C-alpha cells in the first residue's frame, strides 16, 4: 500500500500524490498502527510523502495533516513505539508544522491543553510541538478571529497556567517554556504556577524544578522566584520545628537547592544582587523576617563566590550586630517587650543553620568559619589594652566562638583549620587583647583533645615560638 | 617557567589549589592575550597533574567562564576544553555533567563558537563506555531539533552546523541510522532557505572532507546527491530557455570541442529570475565532487562532461550601449557574473588534481573564460559602486552580517592551492613570440591568499606552516621561469622605448614581486625550527644562476640570492614593483655590509626615468615614494651625508624645469622628500 505512494512521491508533486490522496480517504491511524508494528522510518516516508503531497495552499490536505496529527500526537505516548522513529515523527511534525492558518494551531493547542490537563498523557513527549505551534501562531500575521496571534497565544497560555497542571508533567511543562518567546507577564503567571505547584510534589522532584525555573527566571523574574522559594524552605523548616516541638530530606533538599541557586548565580552576576538587596537587612534600621536558617545557609555558601564575599559577610556581621543591640534593648525594656512579638535572633538562626549543617554541608561551615574568625578578629576587646561596646561585641565575639566548637565537634574535616586559624592568632599579635582566643582553643581541645593527634604537627610549630611569648600567654 | 614549576614542584602545589583558580578566574577576565594563555596554562596543568577534586573545580570554572563569558575569554575558554577533553577524556567523562548544562545556554555563543561546542559534546558523548550515559545525546538532539525547527536563520545554522557537526563525529549501522534521519530532516528544513542550503551543502562539503570517515552513510549519500543535481540544474541544451528576459540568452561561454546539439546544459538566468537554488549550484556541486572522489576514488568519467558544457547566460557583454538604465537588471547582471564565476571558480578547484592533458586544457579554458568575465564584472561594478550582491562565505562572514576588491576574496568561491599547479605551463608572449591572463589571475588570487592567512574558510584550517610549505614548492621553481620569460619580455620592451600587453605584465612583474615578499616576510621564519624550507628556497634561487653549490653556508646563498635578484631594477616598468623588490632585498638580506646594496638600488629607482604616462605617474604616488626614500635614507651608511645629497638636488628643481637632474623629483612630490628629509633628520 506504501511502495505505490513511494513512486508516486518519487518524481514530482502536487499533480498525482495529491489524487492519490483523493483515493485513501479514511483510517490514517490503522496505517500509522501496522507501519509502527513493522518499522518506524517507512512511517516516516509516508509521512514526508503526505506533507509534500498535501500541501497548505490548497485546504483538502490541511484535513488530512489535522487527522494525521492527531493520530501521531496520540500514539507517541500511548502505542509505544521504539525511541528513535518516536524522535523521527517528532522532528517531521515540528518541521510541517509551519504551514497552517491560525485556527487549525490554535485547536491543536487547545488539543493539548484539554489533553495534558485530563487526558493522563503517559508520557508527555507530544508536547513538545506545543511551543513551536505557539511560535508559529507568534509569528503568523495571517489575522484570526476569536485578534493577533499573539494575543491567541496569551489567551491559550493563561488558561494552560491556571488550568490544573498534573504533578509529574510540571518539569516537562516548564521545560518546554525555556523556549518560547515570553514576556514578563507570561513569564510572571509561568513561575506563579511552578512555585505554586512545590506543596503537592514529592520532595525529590523539587531540585531539578527548582534548577529549570532558574534556568527560566534568567528571561525575566528573579526577584519573585528567589522571594518563592525563600519562602517555601522557610515554612518547612518551621514546620519541622513545631512538629520536632525529616531532616535526612529537607536537609539534603535545602543543601542542593542551595548548591543549584549558586550555580546560577555564577553564571548570572544579577541575580545574585538581586538576592541580596531582596534579603537586605538594613534597610534602615530594621531586621527583616526575610531571614532564615535557609535564607542564611544560603548566604554562606553564596560567600565562596568571589564577587559577593566581601559583600554577604558584611551584611551578615551588620545584621549580627544588629539582633544583638535589639536583644539588648528588649531586655532592658519591658514597655517593648508587650508590644513586639518575640522574633527568633539571628545569633540563634546561625547556631540552628549549624546544627542542621552536620551532615553533609561543607558548602555552607567554610563560610561559617571564615565568619566567626570574622566576628572575634572584629570584636575581640580592645578599649581595656558600659553597655554598648561589652554587650554586642562580648557576644559576638563568643557568638565567633560558639559557632567554631560547635563545628568542630561535627565536622571533621575543617579540623585543622580552626586549629590553624586558631593559632595563627594565637603567636604573633600579643599587642591586642587575645584572651577570647585561648578561651576559645581551651575549649575546643578540651572537647576531643584525640582529633589533635590528627593535626599535631600545627602545634609543635607554635612550639617554636613558645620563647618569644609573653608570660600569661605561654602558661594559659 | 610556568611548565618547570607543575612538572617538578607538583607535591607542593597540590595543597593550594584553591589559589590557583581564585588566581586563574582573575587572569582572564583582562585583555591582552599573553596574559589570558597564561590563565589557560594554568587551567591546563591544574587539570593534568592534581587531584579530582581540582579537576572538578576546573571545569566548573571553565563553564563559567564561557556561559558568562566575553569574546575573547570565551574562545579561550572552549580552546581550553577542547585541551582538557583531548588531554584526558577519562577523567573529564565523570564530569561531562556540568559541561552538559551550558546547553540551558545558547543565547550568547557566536557560531564558530558553537561549532567547538557541539565537537567538544560529541568528542565526549560517543567514548563506547559511556553508552550508560546516551543521556547527553538525547538532550543534543532535543536542542539540534528545536532549533533546526525555527523561521529565525540566525537558529536555522546554529541547527544545522551542530547536526551536522554532531553527525561527523559519530562516524568514526544504528549509527547510520541516525546520521542519515539527522541529515535528512537537515536537507528537509534548509530546502526552504537559499542563504541556509548553502550553508548546509557549503558546510557539509567541508565538514565531510576533514572527517573523512563514515564513508558508508557517504556511499548512502551520494546516490541522492548526483541524482538531485543532475535533475535540478541539468537540462536538455536548449539555446532558448523559457522566459520573457529582456536579454539574448544563449548557451555562452561553452568550450566548444563537446557537441553543440548535446544535453547536458545548466540552467542559470530563468532559475534566478524564476526565484526573483541557483545560488547553491557552486557549493552543490563541490559537495557532489567531493562524494564522488571519496567513493570513485578521484574517478571523474561521470561529470567531466561539466568541465565541457556551455552555460546557458544572457549576454554578459561589456554593456557600454546598456548604461544608464540602473534597475534590478543591474543587480542581475553583476549577480549572474559573480555566479558563473564562482561555478568556473569550482570546476578549476573540481579539476585541477585531475592530470588528463585534455582536461587541464579546458581548465585553462576555463581560466581564460574566467579571467574575461572577472575583468567584465569589475567594469559593471565600476559602473554602478553599491549594487553590491550580498552572498558572503560561511564559515565566519554569514553570522557576520546576519566593491570589486570584495568580491574578488571574500564573496567569490575560494579557490585550492593545487590550483597553482597550472602556473606550470609554459608562458607564450603574443607581442614578441599558458597566456599572460591566465596567470595574471593566478598571482592576484595567490598575492590576496598569503597576505591574507600569512599576516577563507577552506584555507583556514590548514596551518600557516603548511601552507606557506606548499606554496614553496609551486611558486618559487615554476615561477622562475615565468619570472624569466618576463625578464626577456621586458628587455625588449626596454629596448624599443601594444600598451595594453606591455601594462598586464608590468602588473603580473609586481604581483610577482609582492608574492616573492609576501613569502619570505612571513614571521614563522623567526622559530628556528623553518629555516630550513627557507634554506631549501635561497638554494633554489641560487640555482638560477649557477648550479653546484649544495649545502652552502648561510650568508653566501644570501649573496647569491641577492646577486640574482638585483638585476631586475632595469626590468621594472613601474614604481610599485620596484618598492617591493627592494623590500623584498631587505628581508631576504635582514638575515645578516648588506646596507650598501639596497642604498644602491634605491637610488637606481630613484635615478630612473620613469616614463611619465598620467597612471604610471600616479603608481609613483606620494606615499609609496614616502615609504621608499625612509627605507633609503635610514639604510644609508650616513643619514646625514644623504640629507646633504637630497638638499644638493632638492634646490635646482626651481631653475630649470617650470623634471629635474635626479627625476621623480618635481614640486608636487617634493612635500613628500621634504617631510621624510625632515622626519629622518630627527631620526
Known amino acids: 500500500m506504501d511502495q505505490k505512494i513511494l513512486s508516486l512521491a518519487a518524481e514530482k508533486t502536487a499533480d498525482k500524490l495529491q489524487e492519490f490522496l483523493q483515493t485513501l480517504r479514511e483510517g490514517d491511524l490503522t496505517n500509522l498502527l501496522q507501519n509502527q508494528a513493522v518499522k518506524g522510518k517507512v512511517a516516516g516516508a509516508l509521512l514526508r510523502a503526505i506533507f509534500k503531497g498535501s500541501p497548505c495552499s490548497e485546504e483538502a490536505g490541511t484535513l488530512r495533516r489535522r487527522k494525521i496529527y492527531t493520530c501521531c500526537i496520540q500514539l507517541v505516548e500511548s502505542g509505544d513505539l521504539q525511541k528513535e522513529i518516536v524522535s523521527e515523527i517528532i522532528g517531521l511534525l515540528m518541521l510541517e508544522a509551519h504551514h497552517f492558518p491560525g485556527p487549525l494551531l490554535v485547536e491543536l493547542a487547545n488539543e493539548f491543553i484539554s489533553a495534558v490537563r485530563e487526558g493522563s498523557l503517559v508520557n508527555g513527549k507530544s508536547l513538545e510541538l506545543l511551543p513551536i505551534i505557539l511560535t508559529a501562531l507568534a509569528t503568523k500575521k495571517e489575522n484570526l478571529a476569536y485578534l493577533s496571534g499573539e494575543e491567541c497565544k496569551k489567551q491559550l497560555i493563561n488558561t494552560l497556567c491556571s488550568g490544573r497542571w498534573d504533578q509529574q508533567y510540571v518539569i516537562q511543562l516548564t521545560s518546554m517554556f525555556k523556549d518560547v518567546p515570553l514576556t514578563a507577564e507570561e513569564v510572571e503567571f509561568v513561575v506563579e504556577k511552578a512555585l505554586s505547584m512545590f506543596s503537592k510534589m514529592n520532595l525529590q522532584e523539587i531540585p531539578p524544578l527548582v534548577y529549570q525555573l532558574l534556568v527560566l527566571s534568567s528571561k525575566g523574574s528573579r526577584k519573585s522566584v528567589l522571594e518563592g522559594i525563600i519562602a517555601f524552605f522557610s515554612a518547612l523548616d518551621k514546620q519541622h520545628n513545631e512538629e520536632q516541638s525529616p531532616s535526612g530530606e529537607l536537609r539534603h533538599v535545602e543543601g542542593t537547592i542551595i548548591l543549584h541557586i549558586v550555580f546560577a548565580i555564577k553564571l548570572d552576576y544579577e541575580l545574585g544582587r538581586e538576592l541580596v538587596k531582596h534579603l537586605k537587612v538594613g534597610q534602615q534600621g530594621d531586621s527583616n523576617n526575610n531571614l532564615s536558617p535557609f535564607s542564611i545557609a544560603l548566604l554562606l555558601s553564596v560567600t565562596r563566590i568571589q564577587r559577593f564575599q566581601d559583600q554577604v559577610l558584611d551584611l551578615l556581621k551588620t545584621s549580627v550586630v544588629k539582633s544583638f543591640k535589639d536583644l539588648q534593648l528588649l531586655q532592658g525594656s519591658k514597655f517593648l517587650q508587650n508590644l513586639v512579638p518575640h522574633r527568633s535572633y539571628v545569633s540563634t538562626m546561625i547556631l540552628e543553620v549549624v546544627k542542621n549543617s552536620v551532615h553533609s554541608w561543607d558548602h555552607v561551615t567554610q563560610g561559617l568559619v571564615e565568619l566567626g574568625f570574622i566576628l572575634m578578629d572584629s570584636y575581640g576587646p580592645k578599649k581595656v589594652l558600659p553597655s554598648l561596646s561589652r554587650m554586642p561585641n562580648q557576644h559576638a565575639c563568643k557568638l565567633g566562638a560558639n559557632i567554631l566548637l560547635e563545628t568542630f565537634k561535627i565536622h571533621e574535616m575543617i579540623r585543622q583549620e580552626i586549629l590553624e586559624q586558631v593559632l595563627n592568632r594565637v603567636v604573633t599579635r600579643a599587642s591586642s587583647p587575645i584572651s577570647h582566643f585561648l578561651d576559645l582553643l581551651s575549649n575546643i581541645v578540651m572537647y576531643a583533645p584525640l582529633v589533635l593527634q590528627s593535626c599535631s604537627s600545627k602545634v609543635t610549630e607554635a612550639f617554636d615560638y613558645l620563647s618569644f611569648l609573653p608570660l600569661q600567654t605561654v602558661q594559659r | ?683
Open chain 2, 1 to 683: 617557567l610556568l611548565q618547570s614549576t607543575f612538572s617538578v614542584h607538583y607535591l607542593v602545589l597540590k595543597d593550594m589549589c584553591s589559589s590557583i583558580l581564585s588566581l586563574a578566574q582573575s587572569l582572564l577576565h583582562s585583555l591582552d592575550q599573553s596574559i589570558i594563555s597564561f590563565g589557560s596554562l594554568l587551567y591546563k596543568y591544574a587539570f593534568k597533574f592534581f587531584d579530582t577534586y581540582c579537576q572538578q573545580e576546573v571545569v566548573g570554572a571553565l563553564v563559567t567562564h564561557i556561559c558568562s563569558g566575553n569574546e575573547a575569554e570565551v574562545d579561550t575558554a572552549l580552546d581550553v576544553l577542547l585541551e582538557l577533553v583531548v588531554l584526558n577524556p577519562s577523567a573529564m567523562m565523570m564530569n561531562a555533567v556540568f559541561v552538559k548544562g551550558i546547553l540551558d545556554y545558547l543565547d550568547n555563543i557566536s557560531p564558530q563558537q558553537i561549532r567547538k561546542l557541539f565537537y567538544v559534546l560529541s568528542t565526549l558523548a560517543f567514548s563506547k563506555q559511556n553508552e550508560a550515559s546516551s543521556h547527553i545525546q538525547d538532550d543534543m538532539h532535543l536542542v539540534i531539533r528545536k532549533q533546526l525547527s525555527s523561521t529565525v536563520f540566525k537558529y536555522k545554522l546554529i541547527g544545522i552546523i551542530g547536526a551536522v557537526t554532531m553527525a561527523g563525529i559519530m562516524a568514526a549501522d544504528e549509527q547510520c541510522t541516525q546520521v542519515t534521519s539527522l541529515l535528512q530532516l537537515v536537507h528537509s528544513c534548509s530546502e526552504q532557505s537559499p542563504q541556509a542550503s548553502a550553508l548546509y551543502y557549503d558546510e557539509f562539503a567541508n565538514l565531510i572532507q576533514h572527517e573523512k570517515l563514515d564513508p558508508k552513510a557517504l556511499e548512502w549519500v551520494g546516490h541522492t546527491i548526483c541524482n538531485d543535481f543532475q535533475d535540478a540544474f541539468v537540462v536538455d541544451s536548449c539555446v532558448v530557455p523559457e522566459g520573457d528576459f529582456p536579454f539574448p540568452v544563449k548557451a555562452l561561454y561553452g568550450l566548444e570541442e563537446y557537441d553543440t546539439q548535446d544535453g547536458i546544459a545548466i540552467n542559470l538566468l530563468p532559475l534566478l529570475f524564476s526565484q526573483d537554488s541557483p545560488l547553491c549550484l557552486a557549493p552543490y556541486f563541490r559537495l557532489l565532487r567531493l562524494c564522488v572522489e571519496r567513493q570513485h576514488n578521484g574517478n571523474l568519467e561521470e561529470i567531466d562532461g561539466l568541465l565541457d558544457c556551455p552555460i546557458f547566460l544572457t549576454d554578459l557583454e561589456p554593456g557600454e550601449k546598456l548604461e544608464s538604465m540602473s534597475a534590478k537588471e543591474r543587480s542581475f547582471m553583476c549577480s549572474l557574473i559573480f555566479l558563473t564565476l564562482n561555478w568556473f571558480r569550482e570546476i578549476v578547484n573540481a579539476f585541477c588534481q585531475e592530470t588528463s592533458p585534455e582536461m587541464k586544457g579546458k581548465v585553462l579554458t576555463r581560466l581564460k573564460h574566467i579571467v574575461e568575465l572577472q575583468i567584465i564584472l569589475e567594469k559593471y561594478l565600476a559602473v554602478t559602486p553599491d549594487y553590491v550582491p550580498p552572498l558572503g562565505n560561511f564559515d565566519v562572514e554569514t553570522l557576520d552580517i546576519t566593491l570589486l576588491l570584495h568580491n574578488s576574496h571574500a564573496f567569490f568561491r575560494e579557490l585550492d592551492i593545487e590550483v597553482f599547479s597550472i602556473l606550470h605551463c609554459g608562458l607564450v608572449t603574443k607581442f614578441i613570440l599558458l597566456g599572460p591572463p591566465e596567470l595574471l589571475f593566478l598571482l592576484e588570487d595567490l598575492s590576496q591568499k598569503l597576505e591574507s592567512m600569512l599576516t577563507f574558510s577552506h584555507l583556514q584550517q590548514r596551518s600557516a606552516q603548511e601552507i606557506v610549505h606548499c606554496v614553496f614548492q609551486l611558486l618559487t621553481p615554476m615561477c622562475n621561469h615565468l619570472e624569466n620569460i618576463h625578464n626577456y619580455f621586458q628587455c625588449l620592451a626596454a629596448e624599443n622605448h601594444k600598451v595594453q600587453e606591455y601594462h598586464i605584465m608590468s602588473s603580473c612583474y609586481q604581483r610577482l614581486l609582492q608574492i616573492f615578499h609576501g613569502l619570505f616576510a612571513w614571521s614563522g621564519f623567526s622559530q628556528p625550527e623553518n629555516q630550513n624550507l627557507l634554506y631549501s628556497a635561497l638554494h633554489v634561487l641560487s640555482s638560477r644562476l649557477k648550479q653546484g653549490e649544495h649545502s652552502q653556508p648561510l650568508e653566501e646563498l644570501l649573496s647569491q640570492s641577492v646577486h640574482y635578484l638585483q638585476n631586475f631594477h632595469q626590468s621594472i616598468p613601474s614604481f610599485q614593483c620596484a618598492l617591493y623588490l627592494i623590500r623584498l632585498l631587505m628581508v631576504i638580506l635582514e638575515k645578516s655590509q648588506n646596507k650598501e646594496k639596497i642604498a644602491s638600488l634605491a637610488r637606481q629607482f630613484l635615478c630612473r626615468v620613469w616614463p611619465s604616462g598620467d597612471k604610471e605617474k600616479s603608481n609613483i604616488s606620494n606615499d609609496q615614494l614616502h615609504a621608499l626614500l625612509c627605507i633609503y635614507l635610514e639604510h644609508t651608511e650616513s643619514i646625514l651625508k644623504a640629507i646633504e645629497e637630497i638638499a644638493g638636488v632638492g634646490v635646482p628643481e626651481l631653475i630649470n624645469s617650470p623634471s629635474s637632474t635626479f627625476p621623480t623629483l618635481t614640486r608636487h612630490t617634493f612635500v613628500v622628500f621634504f617631510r621624510v628629509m625632515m622626519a629622518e633628520l630627527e631620526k
